[PDB]
Structures are given as C-alpha cells and as structure tokens.
Design a protein around this motif. Sequence first.
Motif, PDB file in Angstrom:
ATOM      1  N   UNK A 164       0.819  -1.206   0.000  1.00 25.32           N
ATOM      2  CA  UNK A 164       0.000   0.000   0.000  1.00 25.32           C
ATOM      3  C   UNK A 164       0.855   1.258   0.000  1.00 25.32           C
ATOM      4  N   UNK A 207      -9.303   2.269   1.762  1.00 30.95           N
ATOM      5  CA  UNK A 207     -10.120   3.476   1.740  1.00 30.95           C
ATOM      6  C   UNK A 207      -9.261   4.733   1.793  1.00 30.95           C
ATOM      7  N   UNK A 219       1.681   1.715  -3.602  1.00 31.21           N
ATOM      8  CA  UNK A 219       0.506   2.171  -4.338  1.00 31.21           C
ATOM      9  C   UNK A 219       0.201   3.631  -4.037  1.00 31.21           C
ATOM     10  N   UNK A 220       0.438   4.062  -2.798  1.00 34.75           N
ATOM     11  CA  UNK A 220       0.207   5.456  -2.439  1.00 34.75           C
ATOM     12  C   UNK A 220       1.311   6.360  -2.965  1.00 34.75           C
ATOM     13  N   UNK A 266       0.524   6.816  -6.643  1.00 37.83           N
ATOM     14  CA  UNK A 266      -0.588   7.742  -6.820  1.00 37.83           C
ATOM     15  C   UNK A 266      -0.098   9.184  -6.805  1.00 37.83           C
ATOM     16  N   UNK A 321      -6.305   4.787   0.203  1.00 39.33           N
ATOM     17  CA  UNK A 321      -5.774   4.837  -1.154  1.00 39.33           C
ATOM     18  C   UNK A 321      -6.805   5.379  -2.134  1.00 39.33           C
ATOM     19  N   UNK A 322      -8.064   4.963  -1.992  1.00 37.02           N
ATOM     20  CA  UNK A 322      -9.111   5.419  -2.894  1.00 37.02           C
ATOM     21  C   UNK A 322      -9.502   6.870  -2.643  1.00 37.02           C
ATOM     22  N   UNK A 323      -9.261   7.386  -1.445  1.00 41.73           N
ATOM     23  CA  UNK A 323      -9.583   8.752  -1.109  1.00 41.73           C
ATOM     24  C   UNK A 323     -10.891   8.942  -0.379  1.00 41.73           C
TER      25      UNK A 323
END
Lengths: 394, 181, 46, 102, 336, 124, 238
Positions: free
Chosen positions: B146, C36, B149-150, B153, C38-40
């Motif tokens: 994660x 949640x 992935x962050x 992003x 990561x998705x924002x």
Amino acid sequence: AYEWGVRSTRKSEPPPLDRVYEIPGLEPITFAGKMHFVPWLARPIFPPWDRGYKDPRFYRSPPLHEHPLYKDQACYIFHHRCRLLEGVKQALWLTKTKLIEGLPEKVLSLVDDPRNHIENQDECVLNVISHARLWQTTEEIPKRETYCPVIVDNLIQLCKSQILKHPSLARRICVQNSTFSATWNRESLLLQVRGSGGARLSTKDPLPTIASREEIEATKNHVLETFYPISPIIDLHECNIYDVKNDTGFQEGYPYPYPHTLYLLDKANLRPHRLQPDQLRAKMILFAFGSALAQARLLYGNDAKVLEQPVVVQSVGTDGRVFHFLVFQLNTTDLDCNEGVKNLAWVDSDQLLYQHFWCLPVIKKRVVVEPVGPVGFKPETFRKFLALYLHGAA
Amino acid sequence: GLEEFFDDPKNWGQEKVKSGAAWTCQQLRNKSNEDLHKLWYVLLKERNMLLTLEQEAKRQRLPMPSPERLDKVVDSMDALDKVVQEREDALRLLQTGQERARPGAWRRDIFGRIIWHKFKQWVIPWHLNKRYNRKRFFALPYVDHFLRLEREKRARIKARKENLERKKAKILLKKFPHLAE
Amino acid sequence: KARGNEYQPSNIKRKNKHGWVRRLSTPAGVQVILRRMLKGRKSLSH
Amino acid sequence: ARNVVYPLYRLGGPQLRVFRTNFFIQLVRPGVAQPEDTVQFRIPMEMTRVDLRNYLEGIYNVPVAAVRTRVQHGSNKRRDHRNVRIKKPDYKVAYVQLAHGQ
Amino acid sequence: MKYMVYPQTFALNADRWYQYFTKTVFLSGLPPPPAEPPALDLAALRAVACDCLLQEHFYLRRRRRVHRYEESEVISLPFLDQLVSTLVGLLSPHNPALAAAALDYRCPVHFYWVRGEEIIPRGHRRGRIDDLRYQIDDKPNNQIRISKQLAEFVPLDYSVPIEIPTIKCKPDKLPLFKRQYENHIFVGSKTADPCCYGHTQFHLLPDKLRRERLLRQNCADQIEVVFRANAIASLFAWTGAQAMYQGFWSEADVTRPFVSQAVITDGKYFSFFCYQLNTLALTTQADQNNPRKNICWGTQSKPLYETIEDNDVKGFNDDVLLQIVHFLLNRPKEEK
Amino acid sequence: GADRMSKWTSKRGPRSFRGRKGRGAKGIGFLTSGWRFVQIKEMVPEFVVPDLTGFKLKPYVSYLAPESEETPLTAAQLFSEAVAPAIEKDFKDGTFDPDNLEKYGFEPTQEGKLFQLYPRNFLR
Amino acid sequence: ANFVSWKSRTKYTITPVKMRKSGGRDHTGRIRVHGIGGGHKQRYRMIDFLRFRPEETKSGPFEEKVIQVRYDPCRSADIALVAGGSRKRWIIATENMQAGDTILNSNHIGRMAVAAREGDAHPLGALPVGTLINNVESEPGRGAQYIRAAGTCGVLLRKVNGTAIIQLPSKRQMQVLETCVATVGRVSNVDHNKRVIGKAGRNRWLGKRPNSGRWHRKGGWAGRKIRPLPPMKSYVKL
RNA sequence: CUCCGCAUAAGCCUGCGUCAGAUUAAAAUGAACUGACAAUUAACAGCCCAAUAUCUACAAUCAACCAACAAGUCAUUAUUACCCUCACUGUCAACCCAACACAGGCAUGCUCAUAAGGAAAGGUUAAAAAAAGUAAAAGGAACUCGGCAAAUCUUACCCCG
RNA sequence: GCUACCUAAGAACAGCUAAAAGAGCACACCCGUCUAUGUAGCAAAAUAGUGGGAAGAUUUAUAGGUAGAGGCGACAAACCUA
RNA sequence: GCUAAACCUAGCCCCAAACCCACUCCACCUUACUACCAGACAACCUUAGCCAAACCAUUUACCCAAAUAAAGUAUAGGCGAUA
Ligand SMILES: [K+]
Ligand SMILES: [K+]
Ligand SMILES: [K+]
Ligand SMILES: [K+]
Ligand SMILES: [Mg+2]
Ligand SMILES: [Mg+2]
Ligand SMILES: [Mg+2]
Ligand SMILES: [Mg+2]
Ligand SMILES: [Mg+2]
Ligand SMILES: [Mg+2]
Ligand SMILES: [Mg+2]
Ligand SMILES: [Mg+2]
Ligand SMILES: [Mg+2]
Ligand SMILES: [Mg+2]
Ligand SMILES: [Mg+2]
Ligand SMILES: [Mg+2]
Ligand SMILES: [Mg+2]
Ligand SMILES: [Mg+2]
Ligand SMILES: [Mg+2]
Ligand SMILES: [Mg+2]
Ligand SMILES: [Mg+2]
Ligand SMILES: [Mg+2]
Ligand SMILES: [Mg+2]
Ligand SMILES: [Mg+2]
Ligand SMILES: [Mg+2]
Ligand SMILES: [Mg+2]
Ligand SMILES: [Mg+2]
Ligand SMILES: [Mg+2]
Ligand SMILES: [Mg+2]
C-alpha cells in the motif's frame, strides 16, 4: 485434592525471556530507547518503579505482618453481622452466664396495676402498628427496612408520654450512632465485642440490682453447657490485627453514661439476611454483656474479680413483628475460668405483638374475608415493653 | 464593569468611527514584557467590544460601522503574540538548545507512514500504562504494497501537474509569439 | 411478513461492529482502512 | 486558554496561572425575556463557567452570583450547489446573574 | 409536565418567585400575639440543648474520621433529631397536645397545584391553552402532626396593604425545570391516619447551601433568601395538603384558615416562620375574583451558640431556645 | 441510514455515550464515591490581570509614525545585547572562568524552577 | 470469542456462588454438546469431597455435627451442612442423615475392623468385607471421584497386600490402596430413578433442549451386545 | 371521530419559532423549501469509588398460616490511607425503521375513556359494471367439490396424531 | 442491528371460573385458520372481518457470542440484512 | 413560433527526463480525531481455480535483472495439448 480456580482464569505465565539474556558479557538491544514495543527487538527488563510521593487515590497498604497492631495471638471479634451457630447456648458460654426463662417479678410488677397503663393503651398501640405498616409512606406496602425502626421509635415515644405520672423519666435520652467495645478471656481465648447500630437508651442513674446476694452465690453449682464438636468461637471474626482496648462510646463527663436499654432491629427485607430468633437473642446477650462490662472496667478498674455492685443492662430485639426481651446482670469480671460465680440473664422468647397485618382488603368471590388491619394483636407483649422502660423510674 | 463591552455612548448610531493604525511587530519589540502583558488586556477588551457590536449588527440586520477596526486589533493581537513567543524561543535555545517547546519524536504509525508524535503528560512510566501500550508505532509487512501504491498515486498527480504546465507555456506562445526571447 | 426494515439503528452496535478500534484490531481491518485511504474516502470508518 | 497544553498537576504543586488568555467573549442580546439581573454571553466551547466568573471579575471587575451554560447546536441542514452540507458552527451560551442587586 | 419546586434551592431570589407561585405575602417578625384570657424551668431546657449539642460534637466517639461534607448528615442531623425528641417530653406537662402527637423523622410531604396558564409556543399543540402545574416534593428532618387543628393567627378575610411580586418572564428562568411523574398530595401520612393536622416542621439546610459557601460566591444577600424560600414552599405544601385532606380544593376554597410552623436551621443559625393558608384557589378561573391571599411571617437568622470548644458551649443564646419552646407550647384552642 | 460523514459529538448516542464525551474543556478535579465531584483550586487557571491605571499604550497607533523595518529577534541577537556586555567587562577586569557562567545568567538545568523552558510547564 | 469461565473463585466457602450457563458451547463459541440450554437459574454450593481434611491447627481423627440436609440443584443427591471446630462445609449426604447426627472422619487403620456406621468416613483397610461405600478415591488425598450420584453404592470385596478391591455401581471391579478414604452407606435420594418428568416443559426447566427432528438410520452399532465384564481397573503401581 | 393521548428509553439532529420570499402544497392565508435571526440554562439523567486480608447455609409470593420445586436479584468485618468540594455532558421539533409527509414495523410508565389528540365529504350528478353494508314475501342447503360466505348458537360418529 | 440457536442481567401478562394446572372463558400482547379486497398496492406479503394461543416449551427491550469447505436448526433441505 | 440547436476550453492520455519521501497551535488505536494512572496480546507458513486439452483425472506460457543472435534448437511432455 481438588483445587479451586481453573488455570484459564488465572494470570498467564509471563512470556519466556529472550536467549540473549543468558549469554554473559553481551548487552541486549531492546526497544526501551524507542519508548514503545516492536516485535523485532528484545523485551527490556524495567526495575521496580515507585511513585515517590503520597497519593490517597492510589495508596497501597503495607503487608499485614508489617502493621504495628499485629499480634500472633488471634482475637475473635463479635460484631453486629456475626450469626452464631448454636445461638444462645454459645452466648451463655462466651459470657459465662445463666439463663432464666421469664422476666424478673419486680420488672413485671411495674405494670401489674391499672395505674401505670397508658390512656387508651389498646387503641394507641394499634395506631402505631397501622401507621408503620399502612399509613407511613406513599407506597401501598411499606418495606421492612422502613417500618421496623418506625414501629419502635413510636412505641418509645408512646412510653415516653407517661412523664406526667413519673417525673423521673426526664433524666434519660435515646442515643443513636453509638459504639462500644469490651475485651475479655474465656479459657485462654481472647474475645472482643464491638457493638454498633441500634438505639442506646441512656440514663443518669444506674439500674438497681435484680438478684440478691444469695441468688448470686447459688450460681456456683450451675455448669455451663457444651456443644462438642462445635467450638464456642465459631462464626466469629478471627482477627490478628487488633488493639485490646475498652470503650463505652462516650468520653469522660457525659451526663448519660449509664446504659439502660439497647434496641436492636432486624431491618432487612430478604429473609436470608435477617437473623433467626435464637441468633438474635444471642446478639442481645453479647451486646448487653459488652455494655455492662464496659462500665465495670471503667468503675472498678481493669482487674478480674466478683463485682460488689453488679451492673444491670436491658435489651429489646425486634424483627418488626416479634419482640425479644432481655435483662442481663453482670455479677463478675473473672470469666477465664468456668467455675465460681456466674452472671444472670432473664429472657422472654417469641413475644408476638401481632400475628399478621393485611394492607389490602382480602376479597374472595366478591366477599371481604379479611379487612385491612392487624391480626391477632396481643396487648401483653406491649406491657413487657412498657415495664422495661419504666424500670428504675417508678 | 459591563460598560466596557460597548463603545462610547456618543459613538452609538454613527456610521464611521475613526481609528488609528494597527500595532506592528517591530513597534512591540521595544516594549517590555510587563508593558506587553498590560497591552494584551487593553486590546482584549477592545476586541470584545467589537465582537459584541458585530453580533448586534446582525441581530438588527444592519452593517457594522467600521469593520476594519476588528481586523486591526486581531492583527495587533497576533503581532504581540509573535513577539513574546520570539523572545521565549530564543531564550530556550540558549539555556537548552531545543527548537520545540513540546517534546516529540519521529515514528511510524500502524499504517506505515512517517508522523511526528507529540508527547503527552503522564504520571506513570510508559511501560506501566495500559492504554499507551495498546497503541502501535510499527508497520507490518502487509503495508509495503500500500505504501508503494500510495507513492505511485502521488507520482501520477505530480506528472500531470508538470506536463500541464508545459502545455500552457507551449499554448502561450501561439498568441504571444514575441516571447521566444 | 413485510421486509425492508432490517436496519434497527444502535450507535453502540455501530461503533463496536464497524468502528475505528475494531478495524485496527485485526490485520484485515487495517487493510480495509488502507484501501479506503488509497481510494480517497472522506470517511474511513464509523 | 484554548489550543494549548495544560501543565499537569500533582498534590502539593503550584497554582495554575494564565498570564495572557486567548478567550474572547461577546455579550449578546437575549432572544427571549430574561430577568433584569441576568446577562447573556457567547463564549468558546473550551471555556467553563468557573473561568467565565474569574474572567469577568478580574478583567472587568464585575461581581457575579451565578453562571449557567448550555451548548447550542448549529444546523448542518444547509447544502451548497454541490449538494454538500454546510455546518453552522456550534457555540456555547452563558447566563450570568449579577451579585449585589445590580 | 409540571414544574419541580425545590424548597431548599440554589436559585437567586427564589423567595420572590415562590410568593407568586403560591400567592403568598411575606411579613417580617412573628404574628400578632393573641391577647386572650405550671412552671417553665429554663435552666433545665438550657442544659438539654447544650447536652445534645455537646454530645454530637465532643462526647460521642466516632469510629471513622468525619469529613467537612459529612458534618450536616453526621453531626447536625442527629442533634436536630435529638433536640426535638427531648423537648417534646419536657413540655408535655405544659402542653398535653404533645402527648398524643405524631413525631416523624424524614417523612415526605407532597403538594400538587395549578397556578396560571400559558400558550404553547411550538409543536403540534402550538397556540393552545395549557395550565402551569407545580409540584413540591419536600422531606423535612422532623415534623409534628396532631389530631386537632391549631387556631388561626389572623382572620380569613384579613388583608395586608402589600402587593404580591409578579414576574415578567417564565419560570424556566429561575431556573426551574419540568418533568412528568406521579402527582402526590401527602401530609406525611395517609388519609386514614387521624393525625392529619400540622403543628411544627424542622428543616436542616444541606451542605451545598451552607453559609460559608455563599460568601465565596458573592451571594451574601441570598443567605436569608434561602431560609424563607424553604418555609414558603414547605409550609404552603403542608397546609395545602391538610386542606385537601378535609375536602377543600381550588373550586371549593377553604372556609377556615390552615396554619403551621417551621424552624429552619443550618446547624448553628436558626430562623422561625409561621404560615397561614387563607386561600387555595390559585387557578385563573378561580383566582380572577379572589380578594384574599396567603400569609407568611418570618424572623431573621440568629445563632444559637457563638462557638463550641471541647465540652464548653460559648455564647449560648437563650432567646433562640425560648422561641423554639413557644412554638411547641402552642396548642389548639379548647372547646367550652 | 447513519450519517458517517458528520462530526461525532456528545449529542449523539445513548445516555452513557452523551455523558462520557465532552467539548474540549479541561478538567478541574476528579469524581469520588457517590458521584461526588471534588474541585481542585490549583487546577483552575488563575487569571493574572495587571493594573491598567495610567497606561499610555492604547489599542491603536497613530498613522504619523515611521515605517521601520522588521528585524526578527534571534538567539545571537539576545546574547550580544544582554550577556556579552557583562562578559566583556569581566574579560577586561581579568576575572573570567566557565565555572561562573551561572553568575552571568546561564542556567545549567531547568529542574527546581517554577517556569521551565523545556518541557515548559506554564501557560501563555 | 470473549468467553471467560465462571469457575474463578480460589477460596472455599459455603455461600452459594452465582454461575453462568454455557448452552453447550466451548470457548470458541461453537456448539460442542447438543441439547443444553436455558433452564432455571442456579447457584453453586461448593462441595468438599475430601472428608478427612483436618483443620489448619488440628490433626488426626475429628468429628462433625450435621446441621441441615437440603436440596442441591447441581446434583442428583442431597447435601448436608456439617460443622467441626470453627469451620463449616458442604458434603454429600447419605440415605439416613438428619440434623443432629454426629459423623466421624478418621484415617486410622487398626489391626481389627471397626463397626461401620452410615455417614462415617474410614479408610478401606478399616472396614469389613461386604460393606457398602460411596465417594471413594483413586489414591490417598485425591478426593472422591466415584459413587457420588443419588442412591449409588459400592461394596468392598477383599483386601490383598494393602490393596482393596472395590465394586463400582457398573458391576466393575476397581483396585486401590487401603489408605484411601471412603464413606459408609448409600447416597441420598434412593428413589431418584423413579421420578416422572410428566411433561416436556419440565425438561426445559432442567436445561435440556429437545432432540433433533432429523431421521437417522441405525447401523451396526445398534442392537443388543453381550460382551464380558472388562478386567479390573488398578490404580496401584507394583 | 377519538384507531388514542402525555411522558421516558432508543433513534434522528434544528426538520410548520420570528422576519423576508420570485420557492412550495389541489390552493399566487399556510409552509415541513430557500435566506437571515433567535433557541434547549440542573435539582431529572449521565459521568463514580484507596489498598490488603476477611465475611456472606436459612428464596420470592401483602410473608403471617399453608404448600411447593424448577431451589432462587440485593448483607460484611479488621487494619492502613484519606479536611479543597457542586466541574464537564444530554435537554429543540409536527422527529425513528420501511426509496415517499407510506393504511406497515416500534420497548416501558400513566390515562382506560379522556381535561389530551383529531376530520370520513374539492363541487355536482345519483347510469352500468365493481367494492362495503342494511332489509326482504313463500320456501329453508333444493346452492356447491364442499353449508364457502352469511345467519344462528347445535347432535352424533369415523380416520390420523 | 433481519432471522436461527445460545449467554448475561431485566420487563410484561386485566377480569371470571377453578384455585391443583405446559387447565378453560376472555383484554392487552404473540401468532396468521378461512373469506373477500388488493395484485406497479397503503404494503417488494398489506387491509377488513373471522380465527389459534394468551402463568408458559410464553411474549419482549438491551448488550454480547457462533461465519460460508461454515454456522444454526423441536429437518421445513428451514434460516444466516426483502 | 416554442422546445431546442450550435461552440472551446477545463483538463486528460502515451513517452522522455528525474528516484522518492512533512510541518502554526490543539486533537486523534477508548465509542479515532477523547488533556491526566500499575502494564507485559504481538510479525513470518507451497496460492488456488477459471481456462486449454474440443470430457477429464498427469499436464496447461505469466517480467525477475543486456537489446540482438544462437532458437522455438537441445530438452521436457496422458511423448498429447503444449512447455
Ligand atoms: K431529527
Ligand atoms: K402498509
Ligand atoms: K380536544
Ligand atoms: K467442460
Ligand atoms: Mg446542563
Ligand atoms: Mg438435585
Ligand atoms: Mg445440572
Ligand atoms: Mg431422545
Ligand atoms: Mg426422530
Ligand atoms: Mg443528580
Ligand atoms: Mg422535552
Ligand atoms: Mg377529508
Ligand atoms: Mg369527489
Ligand atoms: Mg350497479
Ligand atoms: Mg326471505
Ligand atoms: Mg345437493
Ligand atoms: Mg340440515
Ligand atoms: Mg346441483
Ligand atoms: Mg363459515
Ligand atoms: Mg397433534
Ligand atoms: Mg430486533
Ligand atoms: Mg439466561
Ligand atoms: Mg391472568
Ligand atoms: Mg392455558
Ligand atoms: Mg385458552
Ligand atoms: Mg425454533
Ligand atoms: Mg422431510
Ligand atoms: Mg424434500
Ligand atoms: Mg477442457
């Protein structure tokens, strides 16, 4: 044999130490410097921490043996919450006294004439019962923790209305929230009584003696009954942290030092929490003995011998419907032995003031079978209650 | 008394109330701490009279006479608080050398991201505290994916931002072609 | 009988079942909050 | 003070003192009828009735007999053009009664 | 929903509010003595008051330590309970009525009445006439009930040239809060009890309303307010309950006054009050034309003793003790 | 049907929830047996308000003033103004040693002080 | 699951202890035994199955007096409150036990046997052959783990080399040492097996749930099986 | 008319208070929609407790007779430590769960027919068919798979369990 | 947070008959026998009437527990967010 | 004639280059965003299957540290599919 407490409920063994603490000359790397736990570092060993300052809300008393008032010789304490097993028979051995069914003739002679009775006695006592159990509170049916004290305070207030005839009733008060202590030995057994709860009818003049000198010297032939295998100290608090000391409950100078009557109440709604008849009569004997023994030591020193002026203390124990009457006389302060002069005690057992009270009308098939009010009211029971109050004033 | 929450009676009803300038941070570096501690309460009482007038103007549905007065006092109250904190910060560096008045440390949270932990005041050490030891300051290996992935992003966002700026500049020469220099 | 009223609100049940403390209690609940994040999501939990 | 750390206290420790307070109160007109002695204020949430008393007596030299507080909810019903709710800030109200018949 | 009226209250100037809730006018001093056509030994009564006082403070030995907040419920409550028990036994020769009298310890007194109207401001009932209901749940430390009714202090038609206070706001600003629960009208015992008439109440103010805590809160002028606010409410609720027991109510107003007494103390200071229930019709439909109002007399708070050191009571005041006797001496007028 | 995007407050939840949650007000005591609250006089912030009599300064400043530049105060600026003069004098006198640094104004530790600088134990 | 056992008390007392039911579930929370749930609430009364337990300050044979024989909702037998010295404890009552009787608890193994009275507790090597017994133990100080139910009773068959041969209620023989303490007589409530439940609801009061309605076909396990009495069980190590 | 109503718990969170309105209901006075302003004030309730050892056999049922089993919801002491005290939070409404201003669902106390709370008809006409009711000559199950439904207040028997 | 079963500690059951009741009549309350209506409805299972039970294997609020190769089940292949 | 119609920006995509990575105060693992009290629970462990084989049962490509070429060669494989 079978041990009590399953291991699953007990505290888990501390985690095994890491193997780095077994290698000499090697300092382990722990997370003590990180100030928080991490799985990939050794668990440190912190030293015993002490607050360093006093904080009442977080106080830890020292170990028992370290307490100053600590004795190897145990002291069996009798308090209001103690429920003896053998009842009176066990209290007659702890106090070294002789039981006599029925109250003394002198006490009963006070209300034997129609001169000392109260105006409209039968009708005035019935109103103390109905008020306590029916009219006292807003609730339909008052509880026993509520009407047991009221039905006693009102009976005292009714017996205190005869000051017009006996002006010697103005030299007495009814103290509340009083305590007393008394320590003595019975065949190499340190005994102590700590009285608390109830009302203490105090007076300025001490009660006269009941038994004559010949009746006190005739108790040398009586033998105290035993209840082997049961021990006399059963159902008592075996304490090792105590302080042998005597106390009447008041300091030196109190205008009303002489105790007249002790009023004990079994005001508990649940039946299991209420004493049994035989258990309540034993508490009465021991509390009366502890109050009479507290006066003797103050008046005649802390020695042990046969008293020249025996002390007399009365007591009345009630459950709200049943009353027990006692007249205890302290004849000696040498109780370690079972021989010699013995104390006296006159007791009335199971004197019903009323059999039953209907708070609501009993309607069976649209017919009122039992109306509201007391059932089986006995006036004789109140005459004895009034005689004890008039003893030493008429 | 309660007369200090309102302005001079004569000024009530006026549409303008002349006022001076706001205290500057430099003008306050000459006054003593005792004089600044007295001035703080002179401005405090003027701020409460302006907050009381601002609320009663809404009650009566009218405009405040001189709203700039409140902005000036707020700027003076902030400048004065900057000077005092400046003297305390400099005095802490000399005696101790610390840049922060409150202790703290850099730590990884349960989520795996770096965070500055501000310490709290306790009566017992940290190894005895029930509630502090339930808190975790370490991330397990199921967080690494994660974190990447962050990170990816944020890289996509930063790439669109950089490519967009280049586009605007390339479109800014079509209309102003004399910007080649 | 008639259906559709399965939701009987209870704040205690809501904070104990889907709350922040219970999410972090297990590693699978920490991954829920990470997805949640990561998705924002504006709300990570109740 | 608000938005600051309070030094922890232990038995036998010094008295807690604030030399510069950032509490700012505004006196307001009551919406409904109130007694003559009563005064109404709007104070920050972190403020207590004990602080408002010492705050008024010390700074404004006003004797107060009683202080009562209530928290007033601000409607989160308003929505913007994006249908997102707008919150009116919740605020605290204080009712102060003067001491000597003022 | 009804307002809960607490006699022992922390609200400022509550006495002036309670006068309007009960339509009562307060007068200073005691009622006019009746100029109408045994040996009272003061030396004996003085020793008793000092004995019960010294007992709880010095002579009685406490098992555990007594804290400041526990003093009222551990030192002053027993003393007040004991002072009354002994004084009624020493005054029975001087007042036979006390012989056949009912003495109660911490027995509740309830009264429920309606005074005024309001227009419901909000809700589905907005704009409708609602009555303002009040309830007093009072528990005096002691109270003496008797079978025969005491005599009036002044006539029923008697009127004073003093107006009753009027509020401009609603009772919620006192502060006063509403609640809905069982409505009770209770004199201290049920109706079947023949002793349905009140003689004298004894109240003990709690530690929260203690004098020393009122000087810290800049409420020195509220010291006497707390004393006469309890009397107006406690005595109105008691006399009003006696009248209901006789069958009177708002529509059927009392034909004869109902009186009672009260001794308000904080353990050291004592205040004496007398209350007369002239009217019981307080509703708008019945209070429209009513001329008459209820009355309350009250004295200033005075200390019984200046200081208690060891076993000596310093500055004992006999005038305060004599006033307690006069109340207990009062008896119902006898018939020819 | 619950609003998970609304600020959690003491106004929400059952009775036990609404009493345990607060609004940010600092405590001034503790609860004893019987739900009796004990107030600590030392936990209540005492306002140190000065005498404002004969105080020249006022909320605002006249516009007829110079536009002086801003010179943020630094630790070195404070050392040279206050500490350096005393050191230079003693240096010229010939009696200067590190042991006397406490006499010049230096604080070796912060313990035993009412107003410590780090970690500070006082309010603004 | 957050399951904690109620059997946490670590000190003996005669006060009825409040216990919580299981519903046939283990610490995991899953059903492990079917047919258990509900029933009237019950308070547990600790039973001392070690008859010969001299007091802390006392040693050797002692005697106790029976105070009360009462009903126990946690077992099929009746319990008795006995008091010796300064203590009190619950025990398993025998067929004939009343308030006022004096029971004996001894560990003495005399050369000759002793006249056996019901309720008394003696070792196995101090009783004659053919004597009914109950509440026997495997080894000394282990505590009585057998013949506890209502009406149950064993019998002493023979003594060999400090070992006693006991016959259990299942007509099986068990061998133990002669120093193991047993109680003489039968257990109370002899007519417990003759009770009639009468209605299904009365089994729901005892914490029993109805059987499953699923129909099962019998297998080879079913049917009468005449097999010989298993060998004697011996807890004596040679 | 009164299917109720008032209050508490739970839930909801300003959701028929004032001013204004171009918005709105079938309705260009009202308003639950919009904008601004105001509002629920603690005594009720929530938020509690120094340590160690120790104590706690005898239901409830008007608890007294009496009779039970399914065997039960309420208790301490000893020693040590402990003089400052009324903070914080909930308090509104025509309201919650059912996509709705839904004939559904929704615990407790009081009221037991109300002192509280409400309106079946937008206006007209008075066809069919349909729905819900009332009355019915003589006959009285001839209906129908069946006495379904309605009316009325009834006998006997069988199968299964 | 529905539902199936369980745990902890709670609540409710008029009146009549018999007074013994997994007893009868019969409210509240629980269920849902038959009929009509309704069928994109008031309702993704309802309305009216008629009915079964209603001191018990009863009904019910609150918090907690058992999770899909599973759970729970007085086995209907039931029920475990229409 | 109404309803409508019409627009060119917002930004986005694929590459290249370069590794990447905070902050006023206050609050936040307990019911997150809750000033303040006796604790000791701790992390690691073969992916499976759809599918292909015209069923299916052994088997059936999945970046793994240099583009090209050697080479779809050696080799493996119900010596089948395919690898
Ligand atoms: K709402
Ligand atoms: K519906
Ligand atoms: K109406
Ligand atoms: K296939
Ligand atoms: Mg409040
Ligand atoms: Mg049994
Ligand atoms: Mg069992
Ligand atoms: Mg079976
Ligand atoms: Mg079967
Ligand atoms: Mg309270
Ligand atoms: Mg309300
Ligand atoms: Mg209509
Ligand atoms: Mg129409
Ligand atoms: Mg037609
Ligand atoms: Mg016909
Ligand atoms: Mg036919
Ligand atoms: Mg026929
Ligand atoms: Mg036909
Ligand atoms: Mg039919
Ligand atoms: Mg059947
Ligand atoms: Mg539910
Ligand atoms: Mg259970
Ligand atoms: Mg019934
Ligand atoms: Mg039945
Ligand atoms: Mg039936
Ligand atoms: Mg079932
Ligand atoms: Mg089947
Ligand atoms: Mg099938
Ligand atoms: Mg295939």
